[PDB]
Structures are given as C-alpha cells and as structure tokens.
Amino acid sequence: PEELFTKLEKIGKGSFGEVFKGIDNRTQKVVAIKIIDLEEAEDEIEDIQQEITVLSQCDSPYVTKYYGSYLKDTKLWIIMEYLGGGSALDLLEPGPLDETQIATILREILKGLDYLHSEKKIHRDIKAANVLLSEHGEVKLADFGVAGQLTDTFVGTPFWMAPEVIKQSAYDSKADIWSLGITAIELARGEPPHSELHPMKVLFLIPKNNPPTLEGNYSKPLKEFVEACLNKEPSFRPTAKELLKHKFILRNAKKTSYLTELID
Amino acid sequence: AEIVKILKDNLAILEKQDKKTDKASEEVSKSLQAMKEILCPPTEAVAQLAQELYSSGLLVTLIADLQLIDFEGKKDVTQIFNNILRRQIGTRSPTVEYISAHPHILFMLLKGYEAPQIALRCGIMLRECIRHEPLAKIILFSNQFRDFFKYVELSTFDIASDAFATFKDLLTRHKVLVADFLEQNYDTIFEDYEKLLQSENYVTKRQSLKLLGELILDRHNFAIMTKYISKPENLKLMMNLLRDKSPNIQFEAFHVFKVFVASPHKTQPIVEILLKNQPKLIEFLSSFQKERTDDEQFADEKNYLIKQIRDLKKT
C-alpha cells in the first residue's frame, strides 16, 4: 500500500487528512499524495468516491489528472497530478493583480470550463482557491462541487454560488459562469462580493438583491465581462466558448508562461 | 442505416485476433463518432437508427467486443447505449423491451467488473439499465447477482466502490421488487451479506453495515427486518461490532442493534441474550460515545434503549 509510493514534503494539511509531495517508486514520476483519514470524516466517503468517479472520467490539461486510490486500514491514499504553483488565491496574497494577469487566468478557467461543459459536467465550485497552477505556469481546475442544497448545509461558502442554485431551481453549466464572474471580481478586488458579511446573510442576499458589479479603477471590457457573467437569469449568461471570444480576454490575455513571475 | 452496415462488418473483422484489424479500428471509431452526432437536436433520422441497431443485434456485439475498441470509440459506445436506453415511443420503452428479450447484454456488463480496462464503463451502463424495473429484476433474481459479494471485495478500490454503487442501487431502487426478492432468497443472500460485515476492508465493513441498517428500517422490508432481528447470532455480531476498534463502525452497528432492542415482538433466544447482558449493556450505552455532544437524537436513542433493557423481564 505504502511500498509503491514515497512521501517527501507535506505540501498541505487538508480538512480530513494531509496532502504530500510524492514520487512513484515504479514510474519515477512526481505525483501528489492525498491521504484521507476516513475516521473523523464521518459519512463524506460517498462524496469522495463521487469526486473520484468525475475525476477518472476527465482527460484534459485544464482539469487535474487522477491516477488512482489505495486503501490502508482506515486511511485512503489518493494519487493525483502534482501542481506546486499554488492557487490563484495565493497570487492575490502578495499584492494586486493587473488586468493582463486577470485575463490570462480567466482564459485558462474558460478553457477548462469549455471541456467540462462539452462533456456534460458542471464544476459547481469555481473560485480562485480551486484554480491551481503547475510550476511552469499551467492553470488547471480542481476540487469539484457536490449535489443537493440541504447536503451543502450552517456550513457553506455561498459567495461564488449562482442564485438559481440557492433558489433550489434546475441548474446547468451556466451556474459555473456566475461563479466565474464572482471569481473575476475576486481576482480584481482581492476578495468576492459581500465578503464583509456572514455567509448566512450572503446566502439570502444573492437571490434577492441585484447581481454584483465590479467597481473602482477597472477597464470597460473587464466590467462588461463581469456584467455578462453576473446575470440573475442563467439562460441570458454566455457559454464558456462565447466568453473565450470576449473583448477583454482577446485583448488583455497573454502567454501562460508569464504567470511564473507570481510564485508566493 | 448507412453507417450500421459498415460498423457491422468491420467489428467482425476486429473480432479476429489478426494484426490487419489495426485499420478496421479507425473505421469502427469513425462509425460510432457519426452515430453519436445523430442521437445527441435532430430526432428525424434517430427513429430509423434505433430499429437498425435492434434488428442487427449490434447492441449485443458492441458490449461483447468492447475491450477490442479504442478509448475514443469506447466513450461513443457508452453515449449511444445510454441515449438509446432512454428512448420512449408512447408508454413503451423499446430498449428495455429489447434487453428483456436479450438478457446476455446485462450479464456481459456485470462480468465487466472482472476486466479493469472496461469495469467502470460497464458499471455506468449496467447502472443505467437497472433504472428500469424489468432490467433490475433480471439481474436481482439471477445467480450472477451473488458475484457482487466478490466484486465489492476486489483489490482495486475504484472498481470495488463502483461495484457497491450498483449493488446498493439494485437493493434500494425498486423497493416493491427488492422486498419480494429478499423474502425469497433470504437464507442464501444474508449468508453472503454476513461475509461483508466480517470484511477486513474498513469501507466494505462500514458501507455494508450502513446499507443493512438502511434496508431493515424501510417499510417494504418488514418481513426481512423481523427475520433478521429474530436470529440470535445476528445480535451477537452487532454486540461484537459495538466493541470494534473503529468508532465509526461501532456507531453504524448501533443503528442495526437499536432495531433488535426496540421491537415489541422479540423472540425468546433474543430476550435471553439481552437479559444475560442486561446490566452490562446499561453501563455500556451510558458511556458509549459521550464525545458526540451535537447529536440530541443519539442521546435520546441511547436513553430509550437503556430503559427498554431495564424494563425487560422473563416470560
């Protein structure tokens, strides 16, 4: 169980277990080891298994690769793609991001969303914390959502959630477009809208109040990109392919190798 | 209809272990890619495509020779199968009727778990079939259903987890069908289930114990519930599992155990075990998982069982 892999440095202490930088003793390839203690993580096994099902069905350089799972006593070892470039949320920590960087990151999320939506899949948790970087500058999507609003909750971060998801009405790929619009504000302002409020208050606000708008010293194409995504009506929101041809993305997005400048 | 003729002949060429089949695989995948574009929107040419797949018997050979098809082609086979299966002409569902007349399709999918290269793909399609009561009835009442108890205990976690996913669905979806089935094959089906509660695998032991609790508490499974809680060796197992090294396993056992105690029509061998361990179980449940503070139901549930055991008397 532990004979096929060797755990190097502890790259992160997870919610249920711990994540380590690893190397396959067979193929010599570098991987990420996600060791989950299935104890203390009462239930949630069905949710991990459901995420494994989705990840095993995904084959794209814009969605984190899954290699397999191993069970040792009460601990579950998950072998996935190693991405030592942190997250888009970590890039916001040293300081503010320029519109070139915001457009480059958003383009890569859209490329990932285009694959998932074409494969009839919804990410359900699009945010800077779930947008990961390689080390070379590659941007990949990780940590998908679930299913059933009662099962979501009070526990939950609804800042990125679409109003139809909270309204408990039928939602499709277009819900991730709302989440993208909130992530665009998150990448521009540092934090998502209504961040100053309690999650429960934000949960009720989103379906009631008007959609958020990007305020401050930000260009018209960026403001219009946010406005397009943040529409209370999901059928009025553009597709992932449609937003790839947006005036903001085509003019401000550059090479992904330029994102290597931000590694803290 | 045009594409069907090419795919039928090319698959027979691919059936042969000859090296000349390398060119036929390109033609097979291209045929499946064309069919996917018709079904998955235009529905005029879809009507004729279905009858062509039924009459040819291609829907049988495609699962039979699924391991010889490439990754891209295999994906299309799944998309085609799952779309055709949901087709409905009036009240009738033509594919469910077809697989009812051709049951080998269902067993080929189930035998799929044995081959890791197609196990998960088969699992998805097999699960889609068992959504409909007649197709679930065929697998449930078959001798091949017993293979799940071996398929859920497989070395690869992902396949084993997918095997339990289908197994769980088969025993919880069609509640009227399952209740009648379990009543008929009780002695043989629970002899196999006991091995899952005895499993060395934590996940197999936890999920089986949880599903058992879920099954017994359902209104449809009253006859099965009464039969399970009447057997003395079953209570002994639940009482032994309450002492397991895993607090999650002993909590999952408590929900099966509570059913044995709370029943008014308890059999004499059961009453004897509960009376023989009467003060033992009083002090156990009084200190059992006191760490679970944010659970008022569990606190009330323990006190009820403590009272029920204290109120116990001889006949």
Numbering used by the authors:
A (entry chain D): 20 to 172, 179 to 289
B (entry chain A): 15 to 54, 61 to 335
Authors' text:
The MO25 scaffolding protein operates as critical regulator of a number of STE20 family protein kinases (e.g. MST and SPAK isoforms) as well as pseudokinases (e.g. STRAD isoforms that play a critical role in activating the LKB1 tumour suppressor). Mammals possess two closely related isoforms termed MO25α and MO25β, which share 79% sequence identity. Recent work has demonstrated that MO25 isoforms also interact with at least five distinct protein kinases that are related to STRADα/STRADβ and belong to the STE20 branch of mammalian kinases. The catalytic activity of SPAK and OSR1 is stimulated over 100-fold by binding to MO25 isoforms, whereas MST3, MST4 and YSK1 are activated three- to four-fold.
We crystallised a complex of an MST3 catalytic fragment (residues 19–289) with full length MO25β. The 19–289 fragment encompasses the kinase domain, but lacks the C-terminal non-catalytic domain that contains a WIF motif (residues 325–327 in MST3). Two copies of the MST3:MO25β complex occupied the crystallographic asymmetric unit and in each case the same binding arrangement for MST3 and MO25β was observed. The structure reveals an intricate web of interactions between MST3 and MO25β that function to stabilise the kinase domain in a closed, active, conformation even in the absence of ATP or an ATP-mimetic inhibitor. MO25β binds to MST3 adjacent to the helix αC which has a key role regulating kinase activity in most kinases. Structural comparison with the STRADα:MO25α complex revealed additional interactions involving MST3 strands β4 and β5. The extensive number of interactions between MST3 and MO25β can be divided into three sections: (a) Hydrogen bonding interactions involving the central part of αC and strand β4. (b) Central hydrophobic interactions involving the N-terminal part of αC and residues from strands β3, β4 and β5. (c) A network of hydrogen bonding interactions involving the loop between MST3 strand β3 and αC.
